[PDB]
Amino acid sequence: HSQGTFTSDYSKYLDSRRAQDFVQWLMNT
Amino acid sequence: HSQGTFTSDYSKYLDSRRAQDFVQWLMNT
Amino acid sequence: HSQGTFTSDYSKYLDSRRAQDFVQWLMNT
Amino acid sequence: HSQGTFTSDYSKYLDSRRAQDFVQWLMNT
Amino acid sequence: HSQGTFTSDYSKYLDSRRAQDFVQWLMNT
Amino acid sequence: HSQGTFTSDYSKYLDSRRAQDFVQWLMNT
Amino acid sequence: HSQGTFTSDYSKYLDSRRAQDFVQWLMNT
Amino acid sequence: HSQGTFTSDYSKYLDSRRAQDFVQWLMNT
Amino acid sequence: HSQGTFTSDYSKYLDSRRAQDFVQWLMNT
Amino acid sequence: HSQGTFTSDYSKYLDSRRAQDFVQWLMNT
Amino acid sequence: HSQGTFTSDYSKYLDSRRAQDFVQWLMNT
Amino acid sequence: HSQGTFTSDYSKYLDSRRAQDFVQWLMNT
Amino acid sequence: HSQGTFTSDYSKYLDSRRAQDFVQWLMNT
Amino acid sequence: HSQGTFTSDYSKYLDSRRAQDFVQWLMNT
Amino acid sequence: HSQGTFTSDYSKYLDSRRAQDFVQWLMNT
Amino acid sequence: HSQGTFTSDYSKYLDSRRAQDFVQWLMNT
Amino acid sequence: HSQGTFTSDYSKYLDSRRAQDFVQWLMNT
Amino acid sequence: HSQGTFTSDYSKYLDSRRAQDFVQWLMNT
Amino acid sequence: HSQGTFTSDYSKYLDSRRAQDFVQWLMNT
Amino acid sequence: HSQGTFTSDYSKYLDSRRAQDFVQWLMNT
Amino acid sequence: HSQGTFTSDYSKYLDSRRAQDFVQWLMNT
Amino acid sequence: HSQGTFTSDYSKYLDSRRAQDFVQWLMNT
């Protein structure tokens, strides 16, 4: 697990709507 | 598991709608 | 499992619609 | 399983529509 | 299973439509 | 199974249409 | 099964149409 | 776990709507 | 755990709506 | 089965049309 | 079965049309 | 130019060294 | 040029060394 | 040029070394 | 040039070494 | 040139070494 | 030239070594 | 030249070694 | 030249070694 | 030359060794 | 020359060894 | 020359060995 990146998500929705809104800008000169 | 990257997602929706909205920009000079 | 990359997703939808919206730009000079 | 890459997906939809929308650009000079 | 790459997908749709939309560009100089 | 690459897909559709749309470009100089 | 590459697909459609659309370009110099 | 980055999220919603709204801009010259 | 970044969130909502509103701007010359 | 490459496909369509569309280009110099 | 390459396909269509469209180009210098 | 993001940088150094040092952390729950 | 993103950089160094050092972390739950 | 993304870089170094160092992490749940 | 993406780089080094170092991670659930 | 993607690179090195180092990870669920 | 993708690279090295190092991973579910 | 894809590379090395190192993985479900 | 794909490479090495190293994997389900 | 695919390569090596190393896998279901 | 596919290669090696190494797999179901 | 496919190769080796190594597999169902 030295470089291990463990991700766990459990999702349960009844009559539901998910709206994840993400704007990202990254310019390096 | 030295470089192991474990990802687990469990999904269950009844009459549902998922809207993941992602904008990403990355220019490096 | 030294370089193992385990991915598990379980999906179950009743009368549902999935909309994963992803925009990605990556130019390196 | 030293280089093993295990992927498992279980899908079940009743009267459903899937819309995975992915835009990717990658030019390296 | 040292280089084993196991992929399993189970699909079942009733009156359904699948739309996987993927755009990929990769030029390296 | 040292270099084994096992792929299993089970498909069952009633009155359904599948639209897998893939664009890929890869030129290396 | 040392170099075995096992592929299994089971297909059953009632009044259905399959549209797998794949564009691939790969030139290496 | 020397470089381990463990993330765990458990989600359960009944008749719910999630609205994560994120605007990010980062240009460095 | 020398560079470990552990994040844990547990979420449970009954008839609820989440509105995380974030505006961020960062330009360095 | 040391170099065995086993492929099995079972197909059954009622009033159906299959359209597998594949474009591939590969020139190496 | 050391070099055995077993292929099995079962086909049954009622009022159906099959259109497998394949373009392949491979020149190596 | 409605969504146009124009970036121009002109750089000329004689016997010079550039050290842009940036640390950024952003976790939202 | 409605979505045009024009980037121009001109670089000329005599006996020079460039050190652009960037650390970025962004996890949203 | 409606979606045109024009990038131009001109590089000329005499006895020089370039060190662009970029660390980026982005996980959205 | 409606979707045109023009990239031009001109490179000339005398007794030089280029070290472009890029680390990128992007998992969306 | 409606979908034209023109890329031009001119390279000339005397006693030189090029080290383009790129790490990219992108899993979407 | 409506779908034309023109790529031109000119390379000339005296006593030189080229090391283009690229790692890419892309799994979409 | 409507679908023309013109590629030109000119290579000349004196006492030189070329090392183009490319790792690519792309599985879509 | 409507579908013409013209490729030209000119190669000349004195006491030289070429090492083009390419790994590609592409499974679509 | 409507479907013409012209390929020209000129090769000349003195005391040289060529090592073009290509691994490609492409299974579509 | 409407469907003409002209290929020309000129080869001359003094005390040389050629090693073109190509692995290709393509199964479509 | 409407369907003409002209191929010309000129080969001359002094104390040389040629090793063209090609593996190809193509099964379509």
Q: Which phi and psi angles does J25 have, rounded to 5°?
A: -135, 130
- Interchain contact E/Q (3 or more Cβ pairs less than 8 Å): yes
Q: Which residues of T1-29 are buried (b: 16+ CB within 10 A; e: fewer)?
A: eebbbbbbbebbbeebebbbbbbbbbbbb
> Whole-angstrom Cα distance, residue D17 to residue I14?
27
Which residues on chain D are in Cβ contact (under 8 Å) with R27?
Answer: 7
Evaluated on CA atoms G13, V27, S3, N5, the torsion sign reads positive
At C14, list the tokens.
């009743």
Contact yes or no for G29 and S9 at CB 8 A: yes
Contact yes or no for U26 and J26 at CB 8 A: no
At T24, list the tokens.
């490609």
CB neighbours of residue D1 within 10 Å: 16
CA angle E6, E12, E13 (to 5 degrees): 140
- Report the Cα–Cα distance between both ends of chain D, in Å, rounded: 35
CB neighbours of residue V4 within 10 Å: 12
Q: How many helices (H) and strands (E) does chain C have?
A: 0, 2
DSSP string spanning chain N? Answer: --S---EEEEEEEES-EEEEEEEEEEEE-
Provide the shortest C-alpha distance from residue P16 to chain D (in Å).
Answer: 16
- Cα atoms in the Cβ-side hemisphere of radius 13 Å centred on D25: 20
- Using an 8 Å Cβ cutoff, are A28 and M22 in contact? yes
Contact yes or no for C24 and O28 at CB 8 A: no
Please report, to the nearest 10 degrees, the dihedral formed by the alpha carbons of residues R19, P10, C28, E25 taken in order: -80
Overall size of chain B counted in residues: 29
- Using an 8 Å Cβ cutoff, are R15 and Q13 in contact? no
Which residues on chain B are in Cβ contact (under 8 Å) with O26?
Answer: 24
Q: What is the DSSP letter of I6?
A: -
> Whole-angstrom Cα distance, residue U4 to residue U10?
20
Q: Which residues of C1-29 are buried (b: 16+ CB within 10 A; e: fewer)?
A: beebbbbbbebbbeebbbbbbbbbbbbbb
Which among M22, M26, M28 has the least Cβ separation from residue H20?
M28
The one-letter amino acid at M1: H
Q: Which residue of Q has its CA nearest to D18?
A: Q29
DSSP string spanning O1-29? Answer: --S---EEEEEEEES-EEEEEEEEEEEE-
T16 in contact with G at a CB cutoff of 8 Å? no
Provide the shortest C-alpha distance from residue C24 to chain B (in Å).
Answer: 5
Overall size of chain I counted in residues: 29
- Edge-to-edge, what's the strand order for the sheet holding D7-14? I7-14, H7-14, A7-14, B7-14, C7-14, D7-14, E7-14, F7-14, G7-14, J7-14, K7-14
- Interchain contact P/E (3 or more Cβ pairs less than 8 Å): yes
Report strand pairing: R7-14 vs M7-14.
Answer: unpaired
Q: Is V2 left (phi over 0), alpha (psi -120 to 50) or beta?
A: alpha
K28 in contact with V at a CB cutoff of 8 Å? yes
> Whole-angstrom Cα distance, residue L13 to residue A3?
39
Overall size of chain T counted in residues: 29
- Using an 8 Å Cβ cutoff, are E3 and G1 in contact? no
Contact yes or no for G7 and T29 at CB 8 A: yes
- Using an 8 Å Cβ cutoff, are C11 and D14 in contact? no
At O1, list the tokens.
């040039």
